[PDB]
Design an enzyme around this catalytic site. Structure first.
Site, PDB file in Angstrom:
ATOM      1  N   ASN A 146     -10.221  -2.989  -6.881  1.00  0.00           N
ATOM      2  CA  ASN A 146      -9.617  -1.944  -7.881  1.00  0.00           C
ATOM      3  C   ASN A 146     -10.644  -1.889  -9.006  1.00  0.00           C
ATOM      4  O   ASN A 146      -9.974  -0.639  -9.727  1.00  0.00           O
ATOM      5  CB  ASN A 146      -8.395  -2.556  -8.392  1.00  0.00           C
ATOM      6  CG  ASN A 146      -7.086  -2.185  -7.359  1.00  0.00           C
ATOM      7  OD1 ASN A 146      -7.530  -1.539  -6.527  1.00  0.00           O
ATOM      8  ND2 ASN A 146      -6.040  -2.888  -7.505  1.00  0.00           N
ATOM      9  N   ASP A 162       0.648  -1.013   0.013  1.00  0.00           N
ATOM     10  CA  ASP A 162      -0.129  -0.013   0.141  1.00  0.00           C
ATOM     11  C   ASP A 162       0.913   1.158  -0.169  1.00  0.00           C
ATOM     12  O   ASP A 162       2.001   1.340   0.671  1.00  0.00           O
ATOM     13  CB  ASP A 162      -0.664   0.075   1.254  1.00  0.00           C
ATOM     14  CG  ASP A 162      -1.983  -0.353   1.582  1.00  0.00           C
ATOM     15  OD1 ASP A 162      -2.577  -0.908   0.695  1.00  0.00           O
ATOM     16  OD2 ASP A 162      -2.953   0.436   2.195  1.00  0.00           O
TER      17      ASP A 162
END
Ligand code: 40B
Ligand code: 40B
Lengths: 277, 282
Positions: A109, A61
Protein backbone atom coordinates in the site's frame (compact mmCIF):
# COMPACT_ATOMS: atom_id res chain seq x y z
CA UNK A 1 -21.05 -27.62 18.69
CA UNK A 2 -19.29 -24.56 19.97
CA UNK A 3 -21.70 -21.97 18.58
CA UNK A 4 -23.39 -19.47 20.80
CA UNK A 5 -27.17 -20.17 20.63
CA UNK A 6 -29.42 -17.58 18.94
CA UNK A 7 -29.66 -14.41 20.95
CA UNK A 8 -33.05 -13.44 22.41
CA UNK A 9 -35.09 -11.54 19.85
CA UNK A 10 -34.50 -8.30 21.76
CA UNK A 11 -30.73 -8.68 22.33
CA UNK A 12 -28.78 -5.70 20.90
CA UNK A 13 -27.98 -5.72 17.17
CA UNK A 14 -25.04 -4.50 15.11
CA UNK A 15 -24.33 -2.56 12.86
CA UNK A 16 -26.52 0.63 12.94
CA UNK A 17 -25.15 2.45 9.92
CA UNK A 18 -27.17 5.61 10.56
CA UNK A 19 -24.05 7.26 12.14
CA UNK A 20 -20.41 7.16 11.18
CA UNK A 21 -18.50 5.93 13.22
CA UNK A 22 -21.13 3.30 13.97
CA UNK A 23 -22.00 3.28 17.68
CA UNK A 24 -21.46 -0.13 19.18
CA UNK A 25 -24.54 -0.99 21.47
CA UNK A 26 -24.52 -1.23 25.22
CA UNK A 27 -24.69 -4.85 26.13
CA UNK A 28 -26.17 -6.48 29.34
CA UNK A 29 -23.20 -7.17 31.73
CA UNK A 30 -22.09 -10.81 31.71
CA UNK A 31 -16.44 -12.49 32.01
CA UNK A 32 -16.83 -11.40 28.34
CA UNK A 33 -20.17 -10.01 27.02
CA UNK A 34 -22.26 -11.95 24.49
CA UNK A 35 -21.68 -10.06 21.20
CA UNK A 36 -24.61 -8.27 19.60
CA UNK A 37 -26.48 -10.33 16.99
CA UNK A 38 -26.58 -9.19 13.33
CA UNK A 39 -29.29 -6.68 12.38
CA UNK A 40 -30.87 -9.53 10.26
CA UNK A 41 -31.09 -11.49 13.51
CA UNK A 42 -29.67 -14.60 11.71
CA UNK A 43 -27.97 -17.06 13.99
CA UNK A 44 -24.68 -18.92 13.41
CA UNK A 45 -24.90 -22.33 11.66
CA UNK A 46 -24.36 -25.48 13.75
CA UNK A 47 -20.88 -26.67 12.73
CA UNK A 48 -19.18 -29.37 14.79
CA UNK A 49 -15.90 -28.49 16.39
CA UNK A 50 -13.81 -30.88 14.37
CA UNK A 51 -15.10 -29.31 11.12
CA UNK A 52 -14.68 -25.66 12.12
CA UNK A 53 -11.66 -23.62 10.89
CA UNK A 54 -9.60 -22.84 14.06
CA UNK A 55 -7.96 -19.87 12.18
CA UNK A 56 -9.54 -17.75 9.45
CA UNK A 57 -7.52 -15.12 7.51
CA UNK A 58 -9.36 -12.38 5.55
CA UNK A 59 -8.18 -9.97 2.87
CA UNK A 60 -10.80 -7.20 2.90
CA UNK A 61 -10.91 -6.28 -0.72
CA UNK A 62 -13.26 -4.09 -2.75
CA UNK A 63 -13.61 -0.83 -0.79
CA UNK A 64 -12.78 1.40 -3.81
CA UNK A 65 -15.03 -0.46 -6.32
CA UNK A 66 -17.73 -0.08 -3.69
CA UNK A 67 -17.15 3.60 -3.26
CA UNK A 68 -16.84 4.12 -7.08
CA UNK A 69 -20.22 2.60 -7.76
CA UNK A 70 -21.65 5.24 -5.38
CA UNK A 71 -19.53 8.08 -6.87
CA UNK A 72 -17.63 8.37 -3.49
CA UNK A 73 -13.89 8.59 -2.66
CA UNK A 74 -12.18 5.29 -1.77
CA UNK A 75 -11.91 6.64 1.78
CA UNK A 76 -15.73 6.22 2.19
CA UNK A 77 -15.35 2.54 1.38
CA UNK A 78 -12.66 2.29 4.08
CA UNK A 79 -14.98 3.99 6.50
CA UNK A 80 -17.87 1.56 5.88
CA UNK A 81 -15.36 -1.31 6.21
CA UNK A 82 -14.77 -0.49 9.94
CA UNK A 83 -18.17 -1.76 10.93
CA UNK A 84 -17.79 -4.84 8.76
CA UNK A 85 -14.59 -5.75 10.71
CA UNK A 86 -16.53 -5.51 13.99
CA UNK A 87 -19.47 -7.39 12.62
CA UNK A 88 -17.20 -10.16 11.37
CA UNK A 89 -15.52 -10.34 14.76
CA UNK A 90 -19.02 -10.75 16.41
CA UNK A 91 -19.90 -13.41 13.84
CA UNK A 92 -16.66 -15.26 14.35
CA UNK A 93 -17.30 -15.32 18.14
CA UNK A 94 -20.88 -16.59 17.55
CA UNK A 95 -19.58 -19.34 15.36
CA UNK A 96 -16.71 -20.37 17.70
CA UNK A 97 -13.70 -19.40 15.51
CA UNK A 98 -10.61 -18.91 17.77
CA UNK A 99 -8.16 -16.95 15.55
CA UNK A 100 -8.88 -14.27 12.96
CA UNK A 101 -6.14 -12.58 10.90
CA UNK A 102 -7.20 -9.37 9.11
CA UNK A 103 -5.01 -7.76 6.36
CA UNK A 104 -5.61 -4.13 7.34
CA UNK A 105 -2.57 -2.64 5.52
CA UNK A 106 -0.19 -4.38 3.10
CA UNK A 107 3.40 -3.30 2.57
CA UNK A 108 2.14 -2.93 -1.08
CA UNK A 109 0.00 0.00 0.00
CA UNK A 110 3.00 2.29 0.08
CA UNK A 111 2.44 2.49 -3.71
CA UNK A 112 -0.96 4.26 -3.14
CA UNK A 113 -1.18 8.04 -3.14
CA UNK A 114 0.63 9.52 -0.07
CA UNK A 115 -2.71 11.27 0.84
CA UNK A 116 -4.51 7.90 0.90
CA UNK A 117 -1.63 6.31 2.89
CA UNK A 118 -1.78 9.10 5.37
CA UNK A 119 -5.57 8.64 5.70
CA UNK A 120 -5.14 4.81 6.16
CA UNK A 121 -2.46 5.28 8.87
CA UNK A 122 -4.74 7.75 10.75
CA UNK A 123 -7.79 5.60 10.19
CA UNK A 124 -6.29 2.36 11.48
CA UNK A 125 -4.95 4.27 14.51
CA UNK A 126 -8.43 5.62 15.16
CA UNK A 127 -10.30 2.35 14.62
CA UNK A 128 -8.06 0.61 17.18
CA UNK A 129 -8.45 3.46 19.66
CA UNK A 130 -12.20 3.68 19.12
CA UNK A 131 -12.92 -0.09 19.31
CA UNK A 132 -10.37 -1.22 21.90
CA UNK A 133 -12.86 -1.21 24.84
CA UNK A 134 -15.57 -2.97 22.85
CA UNK A 135 -13.03 -5.66 21.81
CA UNK A 136 -11.87 -6.03 25.48
CA UNK A 137 -15.51 -6.47 26.60
CA UNK A 138 -16.18 -9.17 24.05
CA UNK A 139 -13.15 -11.12 25.16
CA UNK A 140 -11.03 -10.41 22.03
CA UNK A 141 -7.34 -10.52 22.34
CA UNK A 142 -5.86 -8.10 19.71
CA UNK A 143 -2.35 -7.24 18.68
CA UNK A 144 -0.26 -5.87 15.84
CA UNK A 145 1.38 -8.03 13.25
CA UNK A 146 3.61 -6.44 10.69
CA UNK A 147 6.81 -4.80 9.82
CA UNK A 148 8.33 -1.63 11.44
CA UNK A 149 9.94 0.39 8.71
CA UNK A 150 7.85 3.39 7.52
CA UNK A 151 4.94 2.42 9.77
CA UNK A 152 3.72 5.31 11.94
CA UNK A 153 4.90 4.97 15.53
CA UNK A 154 1.46 6.03 16.61
CA UNK A 155 -0.19 3.00 15.03
CA UNK A 156 2.33 0.55 16.52
CA UNK A 157 1.83 2.27 19.90
CA UNK A 158 -1.91 2.28 19.72
CA UNK A 159 -2.04 -1.51 19.01
CA UNK A 160 0.52 -2.05 21.77
CA UNK A 161 -1.95 -0.49 24.16
CA UNK A 162 -4.85 -2.55 22.94
CA UNK A 163 -2.62 -5.68 23.16
CA UNK A 164 -1.72 -4.85 26.81
CA UNK A 165 -5.35 -4.24 27.68
CA UNK A 166 -6.57 -7.46 26.03
CA UNK A 167 -3.60 -9.78 26.85
CA UNK A 168 -5.67 -11.98 29.13
CA UNK A 169 -8.69 -12.37 26.88
CA UNK A 170 -9.27 -15.76 25.25
CA UNK A 171 -12.61 -15.80 23.43
CA UNK A 172 -10.83 -15.01 20.07
CA UNK A 173 -7.48 -13.65 19.01
CA UNK A 174 -7.33 -11.10 16.18
CA UNK A 175 -4.06 -10.54 14.41
CA UNK A 176 -4.48 -7.00 13.15
CA UNK A 177 -1.89 -6.96 10.29
CA UNK A 178 -0.58 -3.46 9.49
CA UNK A 179 2.37 -2.87 7.17
CA UNK A 180 2.38 -6.63 6.85
CA UNK A 181 4.02 -8.65 3.98
CA UNK A 182 4.53 -12.37 4.16
CA UNK A 183 7.94 -12.49 2.47
CA UNK A 184 8.99 -9.53 4.65
CA UNK A 185 7.98 -11.26 7.80
CA UNK A 186 9.96 -14.43 6.82
CA UNK A 187 12.94 -12.25 5.90
CA UNK A 188 12.78 -10.64 9.40
CA UNK A 189 12.68 -14.16 10.98
CA UNK A 190 15.76 -15.04 8.92
CA UNK A 191 17.51 -11.77 10.04
CA UNK A 192 16.73 -12.68 13.69
CA UNK A 193 18.09 -16.18 13.19
CA UNK A 194 21.18 -14.60 11.56
CA UNK A 195 21.71 -12.24 14.58
CA UNK A 196 21.48 -15.23 16.96
CA UNK A 197 24.00 -17.11 14.79
CA UNK A 198 26.43 -14.08 14.56
CA UNK A 199 26.19 -13.98 18.38
CA UNK A 200 27.04 -17.69 18.81
CA UNK A 201 23.67 -18.35 20.43
CA UNK A 202 22.44 -20.52 17.56
CA UNK A 203 24.11 -23.22 15.47
CA UNK A 204 23.23 -22.98 11.73
CA UNK A 205 23.09 -26.79 11.53
CA UNK A 206 20.29 -26.80 14.02
CA UNK A 207 18.02 -24.57 11.90
CA UNK A 208 14.73 -26.39 11.00
CA UNK A 209 11.21 -25.29 9.86
CA UNK A 210 10.40 -24.89 13.58
CA UNK A 211 13.31 -22.47 14.07
CA UNK A 212 11.85 -20.18 11.42
CA UNK A 213 8.37 -20.57 13.02
CA UNK A 214 9.84 -19.65 16.42
CA UNK A 215 11.53 -16.55 15.16
CA UNK A 216 8.53 -15.01 13.28
CA UNK A 217 7.26 -11.77 14.96
CA UNK A 218 4.29 -13.55 16.55
CA UNK A 219 5.29 -17.23 16.89
CA UNK A 220 2.07 -18.21 18.65
CA UNK A 221 -0.05 -17.81 15.44
CA UNK A 222 -1.37 -21.23 14.40
CA UNK A 223 -1.61 -22.31 10.81
CA UNK A 224 -4.35 -20.61 8.77
CA UNK A 225 -7.19 -23.16 8.09
CA UNK A 226 -9.41 -21.01 5.90
CA UNK A 227 -8.19 -18.14 3.78
CA UNK A 228 -10.93 -15.70 2.54
CA UNK A 229 -10.69 -12.84 0.07
CA UNK A 230 -13.64 -10.65 -1.11
CA UNK A 231 -14.36 -8.79 -4.40
CA UNK A 232 -13.74 -11.94 -6.57
CA UNK A 233 -9.93 -11.53 -6.44
CA UNK A 234 -8.20 -14.96 -6.36
CA UNK A 235 -4.73 -14.15 -4.94
CA UNK A 236 -3.30 -14.50 -1.45
CA UNK A 237 -1.28 -11.25 -2.07
CA UNK A 238 1.57 -12.32 0.29
CA UNK A 239 -0.81 -12.42 3.31
CA UNK A 240 0.05 -14.88 6.14
CA UNK A 241 2.51 -16.41 3.70
CA UNK A 242 4.20 -18.88 6.06
CA UNK A 243 1.11 -19.58 8.15
CA UNK A 244 -1.33 -20.23 5.24
CA UNK A 245 0.94 -22.72 3.31
CA UNK A 246 -1.72 -25.43 3.96
CA UNK A 247 -4.86 -23.27 4.09
CA UNK A 248 -8.04 -23.84 2.11
CA UNK A 249 -8.93 -20.80 -0.02
CA UNK A 250 -12.57 -19.59 -0.49
CA UNK A 251 -12.75 -16.62 -2.79
CA UNK A 252 -16.04 -14.74 -2.47
CA UNK A 253 -17.44 -12.20 -4.90
CA UNK A 254 -19.01 -9.55 -2.59
CA UNK A 255 -17.23 -6.27 -2.01
CA UNK A 256 -15.94 -5.83 1.53
CA UNK A 257 -18.29 -2.93 2.51
CA UNK A 258 -21.29 -5.12 1.54
CA UNK A 259 -20.01 -8.16 3.47
CA UNK A 260 -21.52 -9.29 6.78
CA UNK A 261 -21.21 -12.14 9.30
CA UNK A 262 -23.65 -14.32 7.29
CA UNK A 263 -21.15 -14.37 4.40
CA UNK A 264 -18.38 -15.42 6.84
CA UNK A 265 -20.65 -18.23 8.06
CA UNK A 266 -21.47 -19.36 4.52
CA UNK A 267 -17.72 -19.66 3.75
CA UNK A 268 -17.24 -21.61 6.99
CA UNK A 269 -20.15 -24.01 6.06
CA UNK A 270 -18.39 -24.62 2.76
CA UNK A 271 -15.08 -25.24 4.47
CA UNK A 272 -16.84 -27.77 6.81
CA UNK A 273 -18.35 -29.57 3.75
CA UNK A 274 -14.84 -30.13 2.34
CA UNK A 275 -13.76 -31.92 5.55
CA UNK A 276 -15.94 -34.74 4.02
CA UNK A 277 -14.94 -34.18 0.33
CA UNK B 1 1.62 -13.12 -30.23
CA UNK B 2 4.22 -15.73 -29.31
CA UNK B 3 1.99 -18.79 -30.05
CA UNK B 4 3.06 -21.38 -32.63
CA UNK B 5 0.66 -21.25 -35.61
CA UNK B 6 -1.81 -24.13 -36.11
CA UNK B 7 0.17 -27.14 -37.21
CA UNK B 8 -0.25 -28.73 -40.68
CA UNK B 9 -3.25 -31.09 -40.64
CA UNK B 10 -1.12 -34.21 -41.05
CA UNK B 11 1.39 -33.01 -38.36
CA UNK B 12 1.84 -35.82 -35.73
CA UNK B 13 -0.70 -35.75 -32.77
CA UNK B 14 -0.28 -36.74 -29.07
CA UNK B 15 -1.25 -38.45 -26.86
CA UNK B 16 -2.67 -41.79 -27.97
CA UNK B 17 -3.55 -43.24 -24.58
CA UNK B 18 -4.59 -46.67 -25.96
CA UNK B 19 -1.08 -48.06 -25.09
CA UNK B 20 1.12 -47.74 -22.04
CA UNK B 21 3.79 -46.23 -21.93
CA UNK B 22 2.36 -43.82 -24.35
CA UNK B 23 4.23 -43.49 -27.60
CA UNK B 24 5.65 -40.08 -28.38
CA UNK B 25 5.69 -39.66 -32.24
CA UNK B 26 8.73 -39.11 -34.45
CA UNK B 27 8.75 -35.51 -35.58
CA UNK B 28 10.24 -33.86 -38.69
CA UNK B 29 13.69 -32.28 -38.09
CA UNK B 30 13.97 -28.41 -37.72
CA UNK B 31 17.18 -27.05 -38.40
CA UNK B 32 16.84 -26.52 -33.64
CA UNK B 33 14.09 -27.86 -31.39
CA UNK B 34 11.30 -29.79 -33.09
CA UNK B 35 7.84 -28.43 -33.25
CA UNK B 36 5.75 -30.34 -30.65
CA UNK B 37 3.06 -32.72 -31.88
CA UNK B 38 -0.32 -31.06 -31.84
CA UNK B 39 -3.11 -32.32 -29.63
CA UNK B 40 -5.21 -35.29 -30.78
CA UNK B 41 -8.10 -32.86 -31.21
CA UNK B 42 -5.84 -30.75 -33.44
CA UNK B 43 -6.99 -27.60 -31.46
CA UNK B 44 -4.46 -24.67 -31.87
CA UNK B 45 -3.28 -22.46 -29.01
CA UNK B 46 -5.42 -19.30 -28.51
CA UNK B 47 -3.88 -16.01 -29.55
CA UNK B 48 -3.03 -14.37 -26.22
CA UNK B 49 -0.72 -11.32 -26.41
CA UNK B 50 2.63 -11.65 -24.64
CA UNK B 51 1.89 -8.93 -22.11
CA UNK B 52 -1.26 -10.83 -20.90
CA UNK B 53 0.33 -14.38 -20.81
CA UNK B 54 1.68 -15.81 -17.61
CA UNK B 55 5.50 -15.95 -17.74
CA UNK B 56 5.45 -18.79 -15.13
CA UNK B 57 2.65 -21.25 -14.51
CA UNK B 58 2.73 -23.65 -11.52
CA UNK B 59 0.51 -26.79 -11.61
CA UNK B 60 -0.27 -29.33 -8.88
CA UNK B 61 -1.28 -32.54 -10.59
CA UNK B 62 -4.30 -33.73 -8.55
CA UNK B 63 -6.76 -36.55 -8.60
CA UNK B 64 -4.70 -39.46 -10.03
CA UNK B 65 -5.94 -41.91 -7.33
CA UNK B 66 -9.50 -40.58 -7.33
CA UNK B 67 -9.56 -41.04 -11.13
CA UNK B 68 -8.44 -44.71 -10.96
CA UNK B 69 -10.84 -45.37 -7.97
CA UNK B 70 -13.83 -44.07 -9.87
CA UNK B 71 -13.09 -46.65 -12.54
CA UNK B 72 -12.34 -49.41 -10.04
CA UNK B 73 -8.64 -49.54 -11.11
CA UNK B 74 -5.69 -49.68 -8.79
CA UNK B 75 -4.43 -46.13 -7.93
CA UNK B 76 -1.19 -46.85 -9.73
CA UNK B 77 -3.19 -46.70 -12.99
CA UNK B 78 -4.16 -43.00 -12.46
CA UNK B 79 -0.46 -42.14 -11.97
CA UNK B 80 0.47 -43.99 -15.11
CA UNK B 81 -2.11 -42.04 -17.12
CA UNK B 82 -0.78 -38.73 -15.69
CA UNK B 83 2.56 -39.28 -17.44
CA UNK B 84 1.15 -38.62 -20.90
CA UNK B 85 -0.74 -35.63 -19.39
CA UNK B 86 2.60 -34.07 -18.19
CA UNK B 87 4.00 -34.39 -21.71
CA UNK B 88 0.84 -33.10 -23.40
CA UNK B 89 0.90 -30.05 -21.06
CA UNK B 90 4.53 -29.42 -21.91
CA UNK B 91 3.68 -29.53 -25.64
CA UNK B 92 0.65 -27.14 -25.12
CA UNK B 93 2.77 -24.78 -22.98
CA UNK B 94 5.26 -24.52 -25.82
CA UNK B 95 2.48 -23.98 -28.38
CA UNK B 96 1.06 -21.17 -26.19
CA UNK B 97 4.45 -19.49 -25.55
CA UNK B 98 4.73 -20.14 -21.75
CA UNK B 99 8.38 -19.71 -20.69
CA UNK B 100 8.34 -21.38 -17.21
CA UNK B 101 6.37 -24.27 -15.93
CA UNK B 102 6.66 -25.76 -12.40
CA UNK B 103 4.99 -29.19 -11.73
CA UNK B 104 4.39 -30.54 -8.25
CA UNK B 105 5.27 -34.31 -8.72
CA UNK B 106 5.89 -35.24 -5.01
CA UNK B 107 5.37 -33.16 -1.87
CA UNK B 108 7.25 -33.43 1.48
CA UNK B 109 3.74 -34.33 2.80
CA UNK B 110 3.67 -37.46 0.64
CA UNK B 111 6.04 -39.36 3.03
CA UNK B 112 2.86 -39.77 5.13
CA UNK B 113 1.47 -42.26 2.62
CA UNK B 114 2.10 -46.04 3.04
CA UNK B 115 5.57 -47.46 2.23
CA UNK B 116 4.17 -49.25 -0.75
CA UNK B 117 2.64 -45.99 -2.19
CA UNK B 118 5.91 -44.11 -1.56
CA UNK B 119 8.03 -46.76 -3.21
CA UNK B 120 5.74 -46.77 -6.18
CA UNK B 121 5.76 -42.95 -6.56
CA UNK B 122 9.53 -42.56 -6.10
CA UNK B 123 10.19 -45.32 -8.61
CA UNK B 124 7.58 -44.01 -11.01
CA UNK B 125 8.98 -40.48 -11.04
CA UNK B 126 12.50 -41.96 -11.69
CA UNK B 127 10.99 -43.92 -14.61
CA UNK B 128 9.04 -40.96 -16.10
CA UNK B 129 12.19 -38.84 -16.22
CA UNK B 130 14.19 -41.67 -17.84
CA UNK B 131 11.43 -42.34 -20.38
CA UNK B 132 10.81 -38.74 -21.34
CA UNK B 133 14.18 -36.97 -21.02
CA UNK B 134 15.16 -37.35 -24.72
CA UNK B 135 11.75 -36.25 -25.92
CA UNK B 136 11.90 -33.09 -23.68
CA UNK B 137 15.40 -32.39 -24.89
CA UNK B 138 14.27 -32.66 -28.60
CA UNK B 139 11.41 -30.13 -27.84
CA UNK B 140 13.94 -27.53 -26.48
CA UNK B 141 12.68 -28.02 -22.83
CA UNK B 142 15.24 -27.23 -20.12
CA UNK B 143 14.33 -29.54 -17.27
CA UNK B 144 15.66 -29.74 -13.76
CA UNK B 145 14.81 -30.99 -10.32
CA UNK B 146 13.59 -28.68 -7.56
CA UNK B 147 13.09 -30.05 -4.04
CA UNK B 148 14.73 -31.19 -0.85
CA UNK B 149 17.60 -33.76 -0.69
CA UNK B 150 16.86 -35.62 2.64
CA UNK B 151 14.71 -38.78 2.10
CA UNK B 152 14.55 -38.32 -1.65
CA UNK B 153 15.81 -41.45 -3.52
CA UNK B 154 19.17 -41.10 -5.01
CA UNK B 155 17.92 -42.75 -8.24
CA UNK B 156 15.41 -39.86 -8.73
CA UNK B 157 18.05 -37.23 -8.19
CA UNK B 158 20.42 -38.99 -10.52
CA UNK B 159 17.91 -39.30 -13.39
CA UNK B 160 16.99 -35.55 -13.03
CA UNK B 161 20.70 -34.54 -12.75
CA UNK B 162 21.38 -36.17 -16.17
CA UNK B 163 18.23 -34.68 -17.64
CA UNK B 164 19.38 -31.27 -16.35
CA UNK B 165 22.85 -31.72 -17.86
CA UNK B 166 21.37 -32.92 -21.21
CA UNK B 167 19.02 -29.92 -21.50
CA UNK B 168 21.04 -27.10 -19.81
CA UNK B 169 21.43 -25.17 -23.11
CA UNK B 170 17.75 -25.49 -24.07
CA UNK B 171 15.63 -22.26 -23.94
CA UNK B 172 12.12 -22.89 -25.44
CA UNK B 173 10.62 -23.49 -21.94
CA UNK B 174 12.02 -24.33 -18.49
CA UNK B 175 10.25 -27.02 -16.50
CA UNK B 176 10.93 -27.22 -12.74
CA UNK B 177 10.12 -30.81 -11.96
CA UNK B 178 9.47 -30.60 -8.25
CA UNK B 179 10.03 -33.79 -6.27
CA UNK B 180 10.23 -33.95 -2.46
CA UNK B 181 9.39 -30.21 -2.65
CA UNK B 182 7.88 -28.22 0.26
CA UNK B 183 7.79 -24.36 0.17
CA UNK B 184 8.54 -23.90 3.92
CA UNK B 185 11.36 -26.40 3.65
CA UNK B 186 12.95 -24.65 0.60
CA UNK B 187 12.79 -21.31 2.57
CA UNK B 188 14.32 -22.99 5.67
CA UNK B 189 17.14 -24.36 3.47
CA UNK B 190 17.80 -20.81 2.15
CA UNK B 191 17.80 -19.52 5.75
CA UNK B 192 20.34 -22.24 6.68
CA UNK B 193 22.63 -21.19 3.87
CA UNK B 194 22.35 -17.55 4.84
CA UNK B 195 23.10 -18.57 8.49
CA UNK B 196 26.26 -20.45 7.28
CA UNK B 197 27.42 -17.38 5.42
CA UNK B 198 26.84 -15.25 8.58
CA UNK B 199 28.73 -17.82 10.82
CA UNK B 200 31.62 -17.54 8.31
CA UNK B 201 31.81 -13.72 8.66
CA UNK B 202 30.85 -13.41 4.94
CA UNK B 203 27.37 -11.81 5.34
CA UNK B 204 26.22 -9.36 7.93
CA UNK B 205 22.68 -9.93 9.39
CA UNK B 206 21.77 -6.26 8.79
CA UNK B 207 22.41 -6.55 5.07
CA UNK B 208 19.85 -9.42 4.69
CA UNK B 209 16.89 -8.31 2.45
CA UNK B 210 14.11 -10.21 0.68
CA UNK B 211 16.51 -10.53 -2.25
CA UNK B 212 19.04 -12.30 -0.08
CA UNK B 213 16.46 -15.02 0.65
CA UNK B 214 15.58 -15.22 -3.09
CA UNK B 215 19.26 -15.52 -4.06
CA UNK B 216 19.76 -18.43 -1.63
CA UNK B 217 16.75 -20.59 -2.64
CA UNK B 218 17.79 -23.85 -4.35
CA UNK B 219 17.15 -22.54 -7.87
CA UNK B 220 17.39 -18.76 -7.60
CA UNK B 221 16.71 -18.21 -11.29
CA UNK B 222 13.05 -19.20 -10.89
CA UNK B 223 10.79 -16.13 -11.51
CA UNK B 224 7.67 -15.39 -9.58
CA UNK B 225 4.65 -17.62 -10.38
CA UNK B 226 2.10 -15.63 -12.32
CA UNK B 227 -0.60 -18.32 -12.49
CA UNK B 228 -1.03 -21.16 -10.01
CA UNK B 229 -3.28 -24.07 -11.02
CA UNK B 230 -4.79 -26.86 -9.06
CA UNK B 231 -6.87 -29.73 -10.49
CA UNK B 232 -9.44 -32.13 -9.14
CA UNK B 233 -11.28 -29.24 -7.38
CA UNK B 234 -8.60 -28.79 -4.71
CA UNK B 235 -8.65 -25.18 -3.43
CA UNK B 236 -5.23 -24.88 -1.66
CA UNK B 237 -1.73 -23.99 -2.58
CA UNK B 238 -0.44 -26.99 -0.47
CA UNK B 239 2.95 -25.40 0.24
CA UNK B 240 3.88 -25.36 -3.43
CA UNK B 241 6.24 -22.60 -4.70
CA UNK B 242 5.52 -20.84 -1.47
CA UNK B 243 8.01 -17.91 -1.79
CA UNK B 244 7.62 -17.66 -5.59
CA UNK B 245 3.77 -17.72 -5.69
CA UNK B 246 3.25 -15.06 -3.01
CA UNK B 247 1.60 -12.74 -5.55
CA UNK B 248 0.23 -15.34 -8.02
CA UNK B 249 -3.26 -15.59 -9.48
CA UNK B 250 -4.99 -18.87 -8.46
CA UNK B 251 -7.32 -20.92 -10.70
CA UNK B 252 -8.73 -24.07 -9.14
CA UNK B 253 -9.89 -26.41 -12.01
CA UNK B 254 -12.34 -29.29 -11.37
CA UNK B 255 -10.98 -31.86 -13.86
CA UNK B 256 -8.95 -34.83 -12.53
CA UNK B 257 -5.36 -34.82 -13.74
CA UNK B 258 -5.67 -37.99 -15.86
CA UNK B 259 -8.62 -36.34 -17.75
CA UNK B 260 -6.63 -33.06 -18.27
CA UNK B 261 -5.19 -32.01 -21.64
CA UNK B 262 -3.39 -29.00 -23.13
CA UNK B 263 -6.78 -27.29 -23.93
CA UNK B 264 -7.51 -27.10 -20.19
CA UNK B 265 -4.11 -25.38 -19.65
CA UNK B 266 -4.98 -22.94 -22.47
CA UNK B 267 -8.40 -22.22 -21.00
CA UNK B 268 -6.85 -21.40 -17.57
CA UNK B 269 -4.37 -19.13 -19.37
CA UNK B 270 -7.25 -17.33 -21.21
CA UNK B 271 -8.94 -16.80 -17.88
CA UNK B 272 -5.73 -15.39 -16.44
CA UNK B 273 -5.27 -13.08 -19.46
CA UNK B 274 -8.75 -11.69 -18.99
CA UNK B 275 -8.48 -10.86 -15.33
CA UNK B 276 -8.42 -7.12 -14.67
CA UNK B 277 -5.09 -6.26 -13.20
CA UNK B 278 -5.72 -4.19 -10.13
CA UNK B 279 -3.88 -1.20 -8.62
CA UNK B 280 -0.18 -1.85 -8.04
CA UNK B 281 -0.14 -5.37 -9.52
CA UNK B 282 3.12 -6.51 -11.32
O1 40B C 1 -9.99 -3.20 -4.56
P1 40B C 1 -10.62 -1.79 -4.75
O2 40B C 1 -12.20 -2.00 -5.04
O3 40B C 1 -10.31 -0.88 -3.54
C1 40B C 1 -9.85 -1.25 -6.44
O4 40B C 1 -10.39 -2.19 -7.43
C2 40B C 1 -10.28 0.10 -6.77
C3 40B C 1 -9.91 1.19 -5.94
C4 40B C 1 -10.34 2.50 -6.31
C5 40B C 1 -11.09 2.68 -7.49
C6 40B C 1 -11.47 1.59 -8.33
C7 40B C 1 -12.15 1.74 -9.60
C8 40B C 1 -11.59 2.68 -10.52
C9 40B C 1 -12.12 2.89 -11.81
C10 40B C 1 -13.20 2.10 -12.24
C11 40B C 1 -13.78 1.15 -11.35
C12 40B C 1 -14.89 0.37 -11.80
C13 40B C 1 -15.89 -0.06 -10.89
C14 40B C 1 -16.97 -0.83 -11.35
C15 40B C 1 -17.05 -1.17 -12.71
C16 40B C 1 -16.07 -0.76 -13.64
C17 40B C 1 -14.99 0.01 -13.18
C18 40B C 1 -13.23 0.96 -10.05
C19 40B C 1 -11.06 0.29 -7.96
P2 40B C 1 -7.98 -1.48 -6.47
O5 40B C 1 -7.59 -2.84 -6.03
O6 40B C 1 -7.64 -1.26 -8.08
O7 40B C 1 -7.23 -0.42 -5.54
O1 40B D 1 -6.99 -40.50 -3.97
P1 40B D 1 -5.73 -40.06 -3.29
O2 40B D 1 -5.77 -39.79 -1.65
O3 40B D 1 -4.60 -41.16 -3.63
C1 40B D 1 -5.19 -38.28 -3.75
O4 40B D 1 -6.17 -37.38 -3.22
C2 40B D 1 -3.90 -37.88 -3.21
C3 40B D 1 -2.85 -38.78 -2.95
C4 40B D 1 -1.63 -38.38 -2.40
C5 40B D 1 -1.42 -37.03 -2.11
C6 40B D 1 -2.44 -36.11 -2.37
C7 40B D 1 -3.67 -36.52 -2.92
P2 40B D 1 -5.27 -38.18 -5.50
O5 40B D 1 -6.79 -38.53 -5.91
O6 40B D 1 -5.09 -36.54 -5.71
O7 40B D 1 -4.12 -38.97 -6.18
Amino acid sequence: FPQLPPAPDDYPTFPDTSTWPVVFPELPAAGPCRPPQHTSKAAAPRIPADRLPNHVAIVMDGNGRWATQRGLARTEGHKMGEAVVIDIACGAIELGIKWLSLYAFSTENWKRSPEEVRFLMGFNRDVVRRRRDTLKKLGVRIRWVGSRPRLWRSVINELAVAEEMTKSNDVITINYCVNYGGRTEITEATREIAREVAAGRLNPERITESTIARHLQRPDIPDVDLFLRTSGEQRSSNFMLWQAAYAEYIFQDKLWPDYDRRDLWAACEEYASRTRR
